[PDB]
From a paper:
MyD88 and MAL are Toll-like receptor (TLR) adaptors that signal to induce pro-inflammatory cytokine production. We previously observed that the TIR domain of MAL (MALTIR) forms filaments in vitro and induces formation of crystalline higher-order assemblies of the MyD88 TIR domain (MyD88TIR). Here, we present MicroED and SFX structures of the MyD88TIR assembly, which reveal a two-stranded higher-order assembly arrangement of TIR domains analogous to that seen previously for MALTIR. We demonstrate via mutagenesis that the MyD88TIR assembly interfaces are critical for TLR4 signaling in vivo, and we show that MAL promotes unidirectional assembly of MyD88TIR.
The MyD88TIR microcrystals were studied in parallel using SFX. By using a micro-focused beam (nominally 1 × 1 µm full width at half maximum (FWHM)), and optimizing crystal concentration (7.5 × 108 crystals/ml), high-quality diffraction patterns from individual crystals were collected. Overall, the SFX dataset comprised 4725 indexed patterns from 13,528 hits (35% indexing rate) out of 1,029,868 detector frames (average hit rate of 1.3%). To enable a direct comparison between the MicroED and SFX models, we also solved, rebuilt and refined the SFX MyD88TIR structure using an identical protocol as described for the MicroED data (SFXb). The MicroED and SFXb MyD88TIR structures, which were built and refined using the same protocol, are almost identical, with a root mean square deviation (RMSD) of 0.4 Å for 138 Cα atoms. Minor differences in some side-chain conformations can be observed, which is most likely due to the flexibility of certain regions resulting in poorly defined electron density or as a result of the difference in the data collection temperature. The lattice parameters derived from the SFX data were found to be slightly larger than in the MicroED data collected under cryo-conditions. Our room-temperature SFX data also showed a slight increase in lattice parameters along the a-axis, when compared to the cryogenic MicroED data, indicating the lattice change is related to the temperature difference between the two data sets. In our investigation, only subtle differences were observed between the MicroED and SFX structures, which may be explained by the differences in the data resolution and completeness, flexibility of certain regions, and difference between cryogenic and room temperature data collection.
Author numbering: 159 to 296
Write the structure that this text describes.
């Protein structure tokens, strides 16, 4: 009915989505993440159910950015639809995440929003803390 965040990801990054479920849902943060392969019911229009969840049934949206993420078209529609809700990031709704080594360019439409970097070994301690705090604010 009401989720804390929608998780935009390609099938190749589903392994890190499991970590996002263990670290945020099964811990003391008690966040309510929306995973399409788990919570989206079959028979729904992939564009209409994404437009209905991201805009009304999810406060924010997490984007797992990787090289395989760029090749995904469904993630492309969800990412651009998320920016359309607040271009300029006034509401802090679009939270991109980099967990893997990317040999391609970061999405140019997301180059002006803070990214939660998981690959930097000097800031791994604050990764889940900053992520769970952003999804917890109203």
């Amino acid at each position: 009915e009401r989720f804390d965040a929608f998780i935009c990801y390609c099938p190749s990054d589903i392994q890190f989505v499991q970590e996002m479920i263990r670290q945020l849902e099964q811990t003391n943060y008690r966040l309510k993440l929306c995973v399409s392969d788990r919570d989206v019911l079959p028979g729904t229009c992939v564009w209409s159910i994404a437009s209905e969840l991201i805009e009304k049934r999810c406060r924010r949206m997490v984007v797992v950015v990787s090289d395989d993420y760029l090749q995904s078209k469904e993630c492309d529609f969800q990412t651009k639809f998320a920016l359309s809700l607040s271009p300029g990031a006034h509401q802090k709704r679009l939270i991109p995440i980099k967990y893997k080594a990317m040999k391609k360019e970061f999405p140019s439409i997301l180059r002006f929003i803070t990214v939660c970097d998981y690959t930097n070994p000097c800031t791994k301690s604050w990764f889940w803390t900053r992520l769970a705090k952003a999804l917890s604010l109203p």
